[PDB]
Amino acid sequence: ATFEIVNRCSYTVWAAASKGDAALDAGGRQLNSGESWTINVEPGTKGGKIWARTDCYFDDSGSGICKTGDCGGLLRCKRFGRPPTTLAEFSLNQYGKDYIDISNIKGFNVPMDFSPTTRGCRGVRCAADIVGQCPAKLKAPGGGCNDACTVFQTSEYCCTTGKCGPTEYSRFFKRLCPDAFSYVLDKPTTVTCPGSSNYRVTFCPTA
């Protein structure tokens, strides 16, 4: 499946793509403002994610640090990134179908649209200014808006027992972005697409 990742933000981002224990495609690449990077993701990929990382420094071997979404200091991500990270999440060819969503469960750094480029389903988007409006206690001094699990490490925010409810913090993300997951048991905003669809992830789709 092809995912065209487009950076419409006015700042550089370093895109990242991983299924948690492996890179997808090259796993990561710099995207200056306006640049598009097309990756290939193997059919059947389950629990894949794409995100942006901000304010990265890498040396000549691809080792360094990002202020958001850092994936163990690598340019080419092999593992998931450090919160806060707005997440494009997908499982492809799962019994005939693809499933996509956007999640704020690991916080928010960059606004995102995640849409099919082929027929048969709608895209999802979380493009509101969550960083500017972020509650004081969730603001990440590094940049971005942390989820409450990351900040407070409770059973209730992290949904550790499988039995949690919405919270004042989850409701803030859900208010600004109704179409993204705001906590682990949120009512699903997953979109079912035809198996083997292709997609585009656009950072800052409205700015």
Curated annotation (Swiss-Prot):
Pfam family, one: Thaumatin
Localization of this protein: Cytoplasmic vesicle
Entry GO CC: cytoplasmic vesicle
Keywords (A to Z) from UniProt: Cytoplasmic vesicle, Disulfide bond, Signal, Taste-modifying protein
SMART domains tied to this protein: THN
Disulfide bond residue pairs: 9-204, 56-66, 71-77, 121-193, 126-177, 134-145, 149-158, 159-164
Gene3D superfamilies: Thaumatin (2.60.110.10)
Stated family: Belongs to the thaumatin family.
Reported function: Taste-modifying protein; intensely sweet-tasting. It is 100000 times sweeter than sucrose on a molar basis.
Stated name of the protein: Thaumatin I
Organism of origin: Thaumatococcus daniellii
